[PDB]
Amino acid sequence: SGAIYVGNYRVVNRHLATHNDWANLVWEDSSRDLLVSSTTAQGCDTIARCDCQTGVYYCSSRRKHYPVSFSKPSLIFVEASEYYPARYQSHLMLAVGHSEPGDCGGILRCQHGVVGIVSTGGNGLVGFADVRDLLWLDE
Numbered sequence: 001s002g003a004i005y006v007g008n009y010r011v012v013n014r015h016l017a018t019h020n021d022w023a024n025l026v027w028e029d030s031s032r033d034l035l036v037s038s039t040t041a042q043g044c045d046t047i048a049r050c051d052c053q054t055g056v057y058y059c060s061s062r063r064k065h066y067p068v069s070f071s072k073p074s075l076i077f078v079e080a081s082e083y084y085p086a087r088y089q090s091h092l093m094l095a096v097g098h099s100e101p102g103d104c105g106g107i108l109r110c111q112h113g114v115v116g117i118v119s120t121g122g123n124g125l126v127g128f129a130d131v132r133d134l135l136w137l138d139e
């Protein structure tokens with residue numbers, strides 16, 4: 001679990017969005033596993049606007065932060081799950097690191113701000129949904 005809170009927006013994994021997220025929907029994209037909902041309160045977070053390929057993520061299944069080197073946002077094949085058929089997920093960045101399904105939502109940050117959230121993983125890999133291209137989150 002986990003979310004990004006920037007301005008009047010809440011960014012979550014689309015597959016973990018609640019009834020209230022859908023009732024306050026701003027934008028969603030199944031191909032990216034992202035959903036953004038509106039908030040009444042002003043959020044705590046800053047979005048990175050950079051091309052960093054290293055950073056630190058929070059791993060809830062270890063209660064620890066880990067440093068990672070990750071690939072540039074790209075189209076990656078993701079096996080079928082209960083949430084989605086087998087498909088290519090776009091804007092996904094992979095890294096070697098521990099992750100379990102419940103780790104989705106953990107934030108990846110670099111020195112500039114929030115980069116993205118945990119969205120996929122397995123076999124010593126962790127995948128992050130990028131949010132740095134979503135310039136409208138800042139206005």
Ligand SMILES: COc1c(NC(=O)N2CCC[C@H](C(N)=O)C2)cccc1C(F)(F)F
Nearest residue numbers: 033078081083099100101119120121122123
């Ligand atoms: C494949 O199972 C996982 C997952 N689950 C997912 O990646 N997915 C399930 C949720 C939607 C994701 C997506 N964005 O489509 C895919 C995450 C971390 C670790 C593992 C594990 F180690 F068990 F293999």
Ligand SMILES: [Zn+2]
Nearest residue numbers: 050052110112
């Ligand atoms: Zn950066």
